[PDB]
Amino acid sequence: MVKIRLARFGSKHNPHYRIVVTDARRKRDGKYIEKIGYYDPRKTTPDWLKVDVERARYWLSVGAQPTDTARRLLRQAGVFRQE
Amino acid sequence: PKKVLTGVVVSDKMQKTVTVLVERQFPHPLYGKVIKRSKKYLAHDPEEKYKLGDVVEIIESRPISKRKRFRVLRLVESGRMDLVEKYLIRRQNYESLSK
Amino acid sequence: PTINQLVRKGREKVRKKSKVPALKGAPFRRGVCTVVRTVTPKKPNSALRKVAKVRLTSGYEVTAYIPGEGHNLQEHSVVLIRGGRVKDLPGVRYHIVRGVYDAAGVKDRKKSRSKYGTKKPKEA
Amino acid sequence: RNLSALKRHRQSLKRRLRNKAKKSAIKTLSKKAIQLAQEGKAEEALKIMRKAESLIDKAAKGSTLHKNAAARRKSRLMRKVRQLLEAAGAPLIGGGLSA
Amino acid sequence: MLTDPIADMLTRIRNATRVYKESTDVPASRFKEEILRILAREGFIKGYERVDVDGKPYLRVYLKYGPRRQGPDPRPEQVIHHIRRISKPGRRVYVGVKEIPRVRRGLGIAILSTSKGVLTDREARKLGVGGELICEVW
Amino acid sequence: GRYIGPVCRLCRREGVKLYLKGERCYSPKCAMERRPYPPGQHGQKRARRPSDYAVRLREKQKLRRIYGISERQFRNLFEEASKKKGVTGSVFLGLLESRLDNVVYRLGFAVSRRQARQLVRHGHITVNGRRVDLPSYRVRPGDEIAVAEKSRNLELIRQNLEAMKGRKVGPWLSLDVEGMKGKFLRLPDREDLALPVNEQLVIEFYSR
RNA sequence: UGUGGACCCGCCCCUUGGGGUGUGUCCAAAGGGCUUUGCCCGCUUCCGGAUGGGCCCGCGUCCCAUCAGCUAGUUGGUGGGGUAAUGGCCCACCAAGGCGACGACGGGUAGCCGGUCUGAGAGGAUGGCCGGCCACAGGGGCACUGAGACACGGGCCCCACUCCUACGGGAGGCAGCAGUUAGGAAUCUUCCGCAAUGGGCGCAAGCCUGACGGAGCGACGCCGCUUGGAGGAAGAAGCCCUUCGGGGUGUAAACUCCUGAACCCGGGACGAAACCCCCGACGAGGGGACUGACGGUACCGGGGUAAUAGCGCCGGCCAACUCCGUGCCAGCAGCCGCGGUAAUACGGAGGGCGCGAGCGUUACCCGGAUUCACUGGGCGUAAAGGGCGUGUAGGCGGCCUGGGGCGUCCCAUGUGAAAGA
RNA sequence: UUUUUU
Ligand SMILES: [Mg+2]
Ligand SMILES: [Mg+2]
Ligand SMILES: [Mg+2]
Ligand SMILES: [Mg+2]
Ligand SMILES: [Mg+2]
Ligand SMILES: [Mg+2]
Ligand SMILES: [Mg+2]
Ligand SMILES: [Mg+2]
Ligand SMILES: [Mg+2]
Ligand SMILES: [Mg+2]
Ligand SMILES: [Mg+2]
Ligand SMILES: [Mg+2]
Ligand SMILES: [Mg+2]
Ligand SMILES: [Mg+2]
Ligand SMILES: [Mg+2]
Ligand SMILES: [Mg+2]
Ligand SMILES: [Mg+2]
Ligand SMILES: [Mg+2]
Ligand SMILES: [Mg+2]
Ligand SMILES: [Mg+2]
Ligand SMILES: [Mg+2]
Ligand SMILES: [Mg+2]
Ligand SMILES: [Mg+2]
Ligand SMILES: [Mg+2]
Ligand SMILES: [Mg+2]
Ligand SMILES: [Mg+2]
Ligand SMILES: [Mg+2]
Ligand SMILES: [Mg+2]
Ligand SMILES: [Mg+2]
Ligand SMILES: [Mg+2]
Ligand SMILES: [Mg+2]
Ligand SMILES: [Mg+2]
Ligand SMILES: [Mg+2]
Ligand SMILES: [Mg+2]
Ligand SMILES: [Mg+2]
Ligand SMILES: [Mg+2]
Ligand SMILES: [Mg+2]
Ligand SMILES: [Mg+2]
Ligand SMILES: [Mg+2]
Ligand SMILES: [Mg+2]
Ligand SMILES: [Mg+2]
Ligand SMILES: [Mg+2]
Ligand SMILES: [Mg+2]
Ligand SMILES: [Mg+2]
Ligand SMILES: [Mg+2]
Ligand SMILES: [Mg+2]
Ligand SMILES: [Mg+2]
Ligand SMILES: [Mg+2]
Ligand SMILES: [Mg+2]
Ligand SMILES: [Mg+2]
Ligand SMILES: [Mg+2]
Ligand SMILES: [Mg+2]
Ligand SMILES: [Mg+2]
Ligand SMILES: [Mg+2]
Ligand SMILES: [Mg+2]
Ligand SMILES: [Mg+2]
Ligand SMILES: [Mg+2]
Ligand SMILES: [Mg+2]
Ligand SMILES: [Mg+2]
Ligand SMILES: [Mg+2]
Ligand SMILES: [Mg+2]
Ligand SMILES: [Mg+2]
Ligand SMILES: [Mg+2]
Ligand SMILES: [Mg+2]
Ligand SMILES: [Mg+2]
Ligand SMILES: [Mg+2]
Ligand SMILES: [Mg+2]
Ligand SMILES: [Mg+2]
Ligand SMILES: [Mg+2]
Ligand SMILES: [Mg+2]
Ligand SMILES: [Mg+2]
Ligand SMILES: [Mg+2]
Ligand SMILES: [Mg+2]
Ligand SMILES: [Mg+2]
Ligand SMILES: [Mg+2]
Ligand SMILES: [Mg+2]
Ligand SMILES: [Mg+2]
Ligand SMILES: [Mg+2]
Ligand SMILES: [Mg+2]
Ligand SMILES: [Mg+2]
Ligand SMILES: [Mg+2]
Ligand SMILES: [Mg+2]
Ligand SMILES: [Mg+2]
Ligand SMILES: [Zn+2]
C-alpha cells in the first residue's frame, strides 16, 4: 500500500524531514514517489512546515495512507479542513 | 512508439522468416567522422510475401520466437540485388584470412 | 595517421608497469630476513652497504636496504619493507622501516627522527 | 533456536496436498472427457466436460489456479472437445457449448 | 580527380597570396561562389568575377594586401593572415548554434554552411542556426 | 592554534613594518628601527637575487603573517575568492577584512591583531547583541560590533578607547566610542587598504 | 441465489489476445465485536485508480587476433506442453538453416549507474560511504507454500567442514548487530534506548524491530579552537659564529600589568505531538492528558588558574648557512649527484626556512605528459614508408538542375529521481 | 690499469 510518511534528511541531532509519498516497502530514506513537503521539528526557521495541500489531497484520493505523524502535520496545514 | 527500421532482405532460405539488414549512420563519439554500422534483424513474414533484394520497413513486435522480435510492415522498394551482392561479397571474403 | 585509421584502430593507452612488486600493491609488506649482507655499489661510488634478503608475506624473496648508521638486524629477525630504490645498488628495489618489529631505531639520531624511527629525547 | 515459523512449513504441506488433489481431479476428468469426444459419444463427453469446467472454476476460487490459469484449461478443453466432436458430430447434450 | 574543391580553393588563395599575386583563378562552382561572396563582403578579397579559360569557367579572385612596409622585408602585411579548411571529407564537422566558435576573439570569421545558406559566424548566430563549419579566415 | 612566539622578528624577515605588536611597532623599539635586516646568523650577509618563486612566496607570507592566520584558513579563503564573481585580488582582501578578530583591531577596540583575537576568543565582543567568541567569524555589512557591557568596566577596554578619542576610523567603518559600539558599513576596496602587499603576486603564487 | 465474471461458438466495432453482444455451460461468500435495532473490524464477485513488478525492443557498455572461424534445440516452421504473460522456455514432427573481421567463438578481467578524483578542456581514473538496479546467502541442484520466493535467520537432496552419537542415526550454516580467530601494513563496543522516524500484526491498548536514533573507541577525513595579550634592554645568562672590534638566538626570556583553556558551583533544554481520552456524529473542527536514549549532555549565569609543540627540510629543481666531526670510511640519495682532508649534499650543534595538532613517508589515482597527440604529434638523416605490383572489402568523390529530407541545423514538448555539483 | 679534467 502506498503511504504518506516522513524521511529524515537532517544531520546528527539536527533532523529535517521530507513529507513524502512512497510505497511502504521502500526504505524510509530510500526512493520515493513525490516530495510533498518538509518538516523541521526543532522549529529553527520561521517557515518550518510546508505542504502543498492540493497535492496531498490528490494522494489521499488514490489511497495513500498517512502516518499518525504525517496525518498530524497534514491536519496542521488543513488538508482535512472542509469548510 | 514501437521502434521501426528500414532495411534490405538478405536471406530467403528460412520458413516464414526473412533476414533484414538495416544500416545506421552516426558520427564517431570521439574522432567525429561519419561511420556506417549495420545490424541484421530476423523479421516475421507470415505470408512469405517479401523476397531477396526487397527493401522493407521493419517494426518492433511481440516476440515470434528466439531472435525474432520484428515483423515486416510494408515493401518500400522492390528488387535491388546490388545491396545483397554487397553483403554476399563481404561474407564471401571470410573464406580467406583463416590459416 | 588518418581519421579513418583512428576509427579502425584507435590510440593505444600506454600501460604503466609497477616499479614495486610488493604484491597487493600494499603500502608496506612484512617479511623475515634470509641473509644480512654488505654489497659494493655501482661505478662512481664505493662503500659497504648493508642489505637483507627477505621472504615476504607476498610470497616474494627480494633484497631490501638497511638505512641508518648501524642496525640490529640478524639472520632470523623479522622486518617491514618500505619500498623505494637504492640508486647506486642494482636490484635493490625496497627499503626497510626502522622502528618496526625487530629492527630498532638508530641510536643517537638527533636530526631526522621520523625516518630511521627514533624517539624524542629529554633535555635536562 | 526453534523459531515458530515452522508453523508455516506445517501449513505449507497441508495446502500442498489440497492443491495437488484438486489438480489430479482436473486432469483425470479432462482426459476422460476428451477420450469420449475422440470416441464420438457426444452426450457423455458433454456431461463430463461440464463437471471438468465446474471443478476448474472451483479450483480458481482458492489459491490453486486463481489467475487466468483456470481460463486456459477451460479454453483448451472446450476447443478440443468441439474439435474431436467433429467426427459425425451430432452434439447431443449441447449443454456445455454454445449453439 | 580533385579531392576537396574547397580546400583546393582555400589553398589556391593561400598559395597565391604568399607570393603576392594580383589575381588567381579557381574552377567555377556555385558553392565556391558563395564562399567568395562572404570573403568579398568581409573585406578579405578585392572581389571576384566569373571568367572562362580555354572555354572552361573559372573565378578570378582579386587579392588585397597591406601597405608596403619599412626596412628589411618590405613585403606588406597580409589581409588574409590565415585560412584553414575545417570540415574536410572523411571527417565532417557540424556545429549547432551554441557550438559556433568565436574566431580570434571576434577579429576573424567562421564560414558556416547552414540550411539558411552560407553565413559568417556572426550572421549564423543572429540567424540562430548552425551547420557545417567550413573554415577559419583571419 | 595560530603562530605564537617572537613577532618583531617577522617584522624583519619581511623587510616591512608589521604592526602585529600593536604599540612599540610605532615607538622606536620595533626592531624595524635600527635592525631592518632579517633574523639569524646570516641576516647581515648580502642577500642573493630572489628567484621568481622566491618573490611570490615572500609576498604571500607578508600578507598572511599580517592577519595572523594559519595557511589552512588562508588557502581556503583564497579558493573561495577565485570562485566568486569579481576580481580574485581585491575580493580576497575584503574577505580578510571581514574577519571579526581583524575588524576588532580595525575598529580600534584592541591595540594589535593578536590582542583583538583574544578579546573575541574570551567573549568580550558583541555582534548584533549576541556574543561571538570566534575570531574567524565573518562580519556582514551592517552588523553592529559592540563590547559586552560585562567588559565595559574592564580597564583594558577603557584604555584603548581613551586613545581612540578623536582618532578616525576607516571609511568602511564607524564607531560610537562612549557606548563602545561599532558598525561594519561596507566591504573595503583595494584603495581602502594601505597594505604593502601586491595581490597579483599572491595570486601568481597559487597558479602553481 | 448470477449484480457480474470465466469459457467454446457466432455477430458488430477495433485491429496481434482491445471493447461490446447473443445462446449455451461454469463460478460467489464467514464470521467476530460491542454503547446488541444499529454501528465498527471483517467476508464474496466484478469494474476502475494507485503503487510495486514480469517479459520484449533501439542504443551505449574493459583487454587479447599469439582466440578465426562458432553453432544440434543450433536457426526457422506447424502443433502441443507450461506460465500471470510472448517466446525453441520445453516436447514431437518438418525444413537447413542461424552467427562472424561492423570482432562471431574462446581466453582474461569486472557487479553497473547516479556520482567521485583529476584536468583549461577534451579526456583519464574510480564506483568505498549515501541513493537506484542487479546477483548471492558454505559449494551445487530442486521444488513446495503464496498476490508475490525457487526464499540469508523456510523445506527436500548431493558434496566439504564442525558438533552430538547408545555407531543404528541426528544437529548445524553471522556476506544481520556486536564479538572471536585466521590472513593482513591495516579497519571499532559482545554499549544505551522504543523517546523520536520507519516497518510488521491488532478495533484498540499494546507487542516485536542490532531498520533506526544515540553513545563508545581510532588525529582516518573535514572544520572550528587553545598552549596567552600588552609593556619590556641600542639589548642579561647559556649555547653558536668571529676579522676578537664584535655579530647571532632577540622583545624572545626574566620581570610589570590585564584577560581567564581547563576545573569548581547553580539553573538546565529544543528534538514531542500525535496514537489515546472528552465535546461534536468515532468526520471537520475544538478541547484536554501521558509519553526520553542522548542526559543533567547541549546552552545560559557565577567563580577562576599563564596554562601541550611538534615534524620535515635548508647542493640545484626549491624557501632556508655557517662551525665542528668524519676522509671512496661511516653514510645521503625522487632525479642530476655528494664523501677519497676546508664537504652549505654525510653525522651533530647554532641558526634559518615550511607547515603546525599535526608533520613526514611508502603505495595507489589524475596531473605536469602536446609522452597514444579528437582538441593536440610524427616517419630523408633522431623511434617510424610496407621490397614491388595487382586488386577484394571499406574509406574518399568534378560541374549543372530537380525530387526526397537519412546525416546536419532550428523551434515546441516529454524525459534527464533524490543527494551531490 | 680505476675514479677526478681541475
Ligand atoms: Mg520495492
Ligand atoms: Mg479531503
Ligand atoms: Mg462551510
Ligand atoms: Mg460544509
Ligand atoms: Mg522464404
Ligand atoms: Mg513460432
Ligand atoms: Mg502488419
Ligand atoms: Mg565458412
Ligand atoms: Mg597492440
Ligand atoms: Mg639462511
Ligand atoms: Mg632528533
Ligand atoms: Mg504464526
Ligand atoms: Mg490419475
Ligand atoms: Mg502458485
Ligand atoms: Mg580556481
Ligand atoms: Mg555565471
Ligand atoms: Mg574571482
Ligand atoms: Mg576570477
Ligand atoms: Mg565602504
Ligand atoms: Mg590552478
Ligand atoms: Mg448477466
Ligand atoms: Mg449467457
Ligand atoms: Mg457455511
Ligand atoms: Mg474460505
Ligand atoms: Mg495501472
Ligand atoms: Mg554488444
Ligand atoms: Mg527436437
Ligand atoms: Mg509455439
Ligand atoms: Mg509438417
Ligand atoms: Mg555489427
Ligand atoms: Mg569477479
Ligand atoms: Mg574539478
Ligand atoms: Mg572510461
Ligand atoms: Mg567503469
Ligand atoms: Mg554499494
Ligand atoms: Mg548458489
Ligand atoms: Mg561462508
Ligand atoms: Mg546453495
Ligand atoms: Mg500470502
Ligand atoms: Mg533468491
Ligand atoms: Mg544467519
Ligand atoms: Mg549459532
Ligand atoms: Mg595476524
Ligand atoms: Mg562505529
Ligand atoms: Mg489494520
Ligand atoms: Mg526480541
Ligand atoms: Mg547508526
Ligand atoms: Mg653579544
Ligand atoms: Mg610578548
Ligand atoms: Mg581574574
Ligand atoms: Mg521533546
Ligand atoms: Mg514542546
Ligand atoms: Mg505510544
Ligand atoms: Mg459521545
Ligand atoms: Mg481533532
Ligand atoms: Mg533526563
Ligand atoms: Mg564562564
Ligand atoms: Mg607560560
Ligand atoms: Mg615546495
Ligand atoms: Mg636556494
Ligand atoms: Mg638527509
Ligand atoms: Mg678532520
Ligand atoms: Mg675535496
Ligand atoms: Mg672539515
Ligand atoms: Mg652542512
Ligand atoms: Mg646535514
Ligand atoms: Mg634548527
Ligand atoms: Mg585544524
Ligand atoms: Mg603521472
Ligand atoms: Mg594527455
Ligand atoms: Mg595538457
Ligand atoms: Mg610513452
Ligand atoms: Mg591528430
Ligand atoms: Mg577540429
Ligand atoms: Mg613526436
Ligand atoms: Mg630511421
Ligand atoms: Mg620503398
Ligand atoms: Mg624498412
Ligand atoms: Mg560531391
Ligand atoms: Mg558515396
Ligand atoms: Mg530531417
Ligand atoms: Mg539534480
Ligand atoms: Mg537541491
Ligand atoms: Zn614590529
PDB file of N, CA and C in Angstrom, chain A residues 36-72:
ATOM      1  N   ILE A  36       6.247  15.953  -1.012  1.00  0.00           N
ATOM      2  CA  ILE A  36       5.082  16.793  -0.794  1.00  0.00           C
ATOM      3  C   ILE A  36       5.258  17.729   0.395  1.00  0.00           C
ATOM      4  N   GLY A  37       6.477  17.978   0.832  1.00  0.00           N
ATOM      5  CA  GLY A  37       6.692  18.984   1.855  1.00  0.00           C
ATOM      6  C   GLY A  37       7.778  18.568   2.823  1.00  0.00           C
ATOM      7  N   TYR A  38       8.104  19.496   3.719  1.00  0.00           N
ATOM      8  CA  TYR A  38       9.188  19.314   4.671  1.00  0.00           C
ATOM      9  C   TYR A  38       8.723  19.678   6.075  1.00  0.00           C
ATOM     10  N   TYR A  39       9.444  19.155   7.070  1.00  0.00           N
ATOM     11  CA  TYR A  39       9.102  19.331   8.481  1.00  0.00           C
ATOM     12  C   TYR A  39      10.379  19.530   9.282  1.00  0.00           C
ATOM     13  N   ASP A  40      10.479  20.669   9.971  1.00  0.00           N
ATOM     14  CA  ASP A  40      11.582  20.944  10.889  1.00  0.00           C
ATOM     15  C   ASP A  40      11.063  20.814  12.314  1.00  0.00           C
ATOM     16  N   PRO A  41      11.331  19.704  13.003  1.00  0.00           N
ATOM     17  CA  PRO A  41      10.782  19.542  14.358  1.00  0.00           C
ATOM     18  C   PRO A  41      11.306  20.574  15.338  1.00  0.00           C
ATOM     19  N   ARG A  42      12.588  20.920  15.240  1.00  0.00           N
ATOM     20  CA  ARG A  42      13.190  21.870  16.162  1.00  0.00           C
ATOM     21  C   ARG A  42      12.747  23.300  15.896  1.00  0.00           C
ATOM     22  N   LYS A  43      11.971  23.525  14.832  1.00  0.00           N
ATOM     23  CA  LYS A  43      11.325  24.811  14.565  1.00  0.00           C
ATOM     24  C   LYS A  43      12.349  25.940  14.495  1.00  0.00           C
ATOM     25  N   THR A  44      13.456  25.677  13.802  1.00  0.00           N
ATOM     26  CA  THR A  44      14.581  26.602  13.773  1.00  0.00           C
ATOM     27  C   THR A  44      14.348  27.798  12.856  1.00  0.00           C
ATOM     28  N   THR A  45      13.424  27.695  11.909  1.00  0.00           N
ATOM     29  CA  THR A  45      13.165  28.730  10.924  1.00  0.00           C
ATOM     30  C   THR A  45      11.750  29.267  11.075  1.00  0.00           C
ATOM     31  N   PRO A  46      11.478  30.470  10.559  1.00  0.00           N
ATOM     32  CA  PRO A  46      10.091  30.967  10.580  1.00  0.00           C
ATOM     33  C   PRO A  46       9.119  30.043   9.869  1.00  0.00           C
ATOM     34  N   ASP A  47       9.497  29.522   8.707  1.00  0.00           N
ATOM     35  CA  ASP A  47       8.698  28.540   7.982  1.00  0.00           C
ATOM     36  C   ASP A  47       9.371  27.182   8.151  1.00  0.00           C
ATOM     37  N   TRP A  48       8.854  26.385   9.082  1.00  0.00           N
ATOM     38  CA  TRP A  48       9.368  25.053   9.360  1.00  0.00           C
ATOM     39  C   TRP A  48       8.411  23.958   8.908  1.00  0.00           C
ATOM     40  N   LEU A  49       7.347  24.315   8.189  1.00  0.00           N
ATOM     41  CA  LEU A  49       6.401  23.335   7.672  1.00  0.00           C
ATOM     42  C   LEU A  49       5.732  23.883   6.420  1.00  0.00           C
ATOM     43  N   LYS A  50       5.723  23.079   5.360  1.00  0.00           N
ATOM     44  CA  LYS A  50       5.030  23.423   4.128  1.00  0.00           C
ATOM     45  C   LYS A  50       4.507  22.136   3.512  1.00  0.00           C
ATOM     46  N   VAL A  51       3.359  22.229   2.843  1.00  0.00           N
ATOM     47  CA  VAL A  51       2.630  21.026   2.461  1.00  0.00           C
ATOM     48  C   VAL A  51       2.280  20.953   0.977  1.00  0.00           C
ATOM     49  N   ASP A  52       1.729  22.026   0.404  1.00  0.00           N
ATOM     50  CA  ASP A  52       1.071  21.944  -0.903  1.00  0.00           C
ATOM     51  C   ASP A  52      -0.120  20.983  -0.811  1.00  0.00           C
ATOM     52  N   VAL A  53      -1.120  21.451  -0.052  1.00  0.00           N
ATOM     53  CA  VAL A  53      -2.256  20.620   0.352  1.00  0.00           C
ATOM     54  C   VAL A  53      -2.918  19.955  -0.851  1.00  0.00           C
ATOM     55  N   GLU A  54      -3.170  20.725  -1.917  1.00  0.00           N
ATOM     56  CA  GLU A  54      -3.926  20.190  -3.047  1.00  0.00           C
ATOM     57  C   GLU A  54      -3.220  18.998  -3.684  1.00  0.00           C
ATOM     58  N   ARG A  55      -1.893  18.918  -3.547  1.00  0.00           N
ATOM     59  CA  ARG A  55      -1.176  17.717  -3.965  1.00  0.00           C
ATOM     60  C   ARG A  55      -1.380  16.591  -2.962  1.00  0.00           C
ATOM     61  N   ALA A  56      -1.207  16.891  -1.672  1.00  0.00           N
ATOM     62  CA  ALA A  56      -1.519  15.915  -0.636  1.00  0.00           C
ATOM     63  C   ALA A  56      -2.966  15.455  -0.727  1.00  0.00           C
ATOM     64  N   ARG A  57      -3.872  16.347  -1.131  1.00  0.00           N
ATOM     65  CA  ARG A  57      -5.261  15.945  -1.309  1.00  0.00           C
ATOM     66  C   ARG A  57      -5.417  14.948  -2.448  1.00  0.00           C
ATOM     67  N   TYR A  58      -4.568  15.031  -3.475  1.00  0.00           N
ATOM     68  CA  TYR A  58      -4.646  14.065  -4.567  1.00  0.00           C
ATOM     69  C   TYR A  58      -4.327  12.660  -4.080  1.00  0.00           C
ATOM     70  N   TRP A  59      -3.203  12.505  -3.381  1.00  0.00           N
ATOM     71  CA  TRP A  59      -2.763  11.171  -2.994  1.00  0.00           C
ATOM     72  C   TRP A  59      -3.734  10.511  -2.029  1.00  0.00           C
ATOM     73  N   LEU A  60      -4.456  11.299  -1.234  1.00  0.00           N
ATOM     74  CA  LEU A  60      -5.475  10.708  -0.379  1.00  0.00           C
ATOM     75  C   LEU A  60      -6.669  10.211  -1.180  1.00  0.00           C
ATOM     76  N   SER A  61      -6.870  10.731  -2.391  1.00  0.00           N
ATOM     77  CA  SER A  61      -7.954  10.231  -3.226  1.00  0.00           C
ATOM     78  C   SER A  61      -7.619   8.867  -3.816  1.00  0.00           C
ATOM     79  N   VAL A  62      -6.344   8.624  -4.122  1.00  0.00           N
ATOM     80  CA  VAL A  62      -5.939   7.396  -4.801  1.00  0.00           C
ATOM     81  C   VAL A  62      -5.495   6.343  -3.793  1.00  0.00           C
ATOM     82  N   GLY A  63      -5.681   6.622  -2.510  1.00  0.00           N
ATOM     83  CA  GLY A  63      -5.490   5.634  -1.481  1.00  0.00           C
ATOM     84  C   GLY A  63      -4.151   5.619  -0.786  1.00  0.00           C
ATOM     85  N   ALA A  64      -3.482   6.759  -0.669  1.00  0.00           N
ATOM     86  CA  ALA A  64      -2.298   6.813   0.169  1.00  0.00           C
ATOM     87  C   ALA A  64      -2.708   6.805   1.635  1.00  0.00           C
ATOM     88  N   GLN A  65      -1.877   6.191   2.465  1.00  0.00           N
ATOM     89  CA  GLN A  65      -2.187   6.119   3.886  1.00  0.00           C
ATOM     90  C   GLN A  65      -1.165   6.915   4.675  1.00  0.00           C
ATOM     91  N   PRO A  66      -1.550   8.014   5.310  1.00  0.00           N
ATOM     92  CA  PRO A  66      -0.582   8.798   6.074  1.00  0.00           C
ATOM     93  C   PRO A  66      -0.254   8.154   7.411  1.00  0.00           C
ATOM     94  N   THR A  67       0.954   8.439   7.884  1.00  0.00           N
ATOM     95  CA  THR A  67       1.345   8.060   9.228  1.00  0.00           C
ATOM     96  C   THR A  67       0.531   8.854  10.242  1.00  0.00           C
ATOM     97  N   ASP A  68       0.559   8.398  11.493  1.00  0.00           N
ATOM     98  CA  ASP A  68      -0.018   9.203  12.562  1.00  0.00           C
ATOM     99  C   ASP A  68       0.650  10.568  12.632  1.00  0.00           C
ATOM    100  N   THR A  69       1.971  10.610  12.447  1.00  0.00           N
ATOM    101  CA  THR A  69       2.682  11.881  12.475  1.00  0.00           C
ATOM    102  C   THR A  69       2.462  12.673  11.192  1.00  0.00           C
ATOM    103  N   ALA A  70       2.373  11.981  10.056  1.00  0.00           N
ATOM    104  CA  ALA A  70       2.069  12.658   8.801  1.00  0.00           C
ATOM    105  C   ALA A  70       0.665  13.247   8.830  1.00  0.00           C
ATOM    106  N   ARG A  71      -0.320  12.457   9.264  1.00  0.00           N
ATOM    107  CA  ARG A  71      -1.679  12.976   9.367  1.00  0.00           C
ATOM    108  C   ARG A  71      -1.742  14.154  10.330  1.00  0.00           C
ATOM    109  N   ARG A  72      -0.984  14.088  11.428  1.00  0.00           N
ATOM    110  CA  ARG A  72      -0.943  15.201  12.374  1.00  0.00           C
ATOM    111  C   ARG A  72      -0.460  16.482  11.704  1.00  0.00           C
TER     112      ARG A  72
END
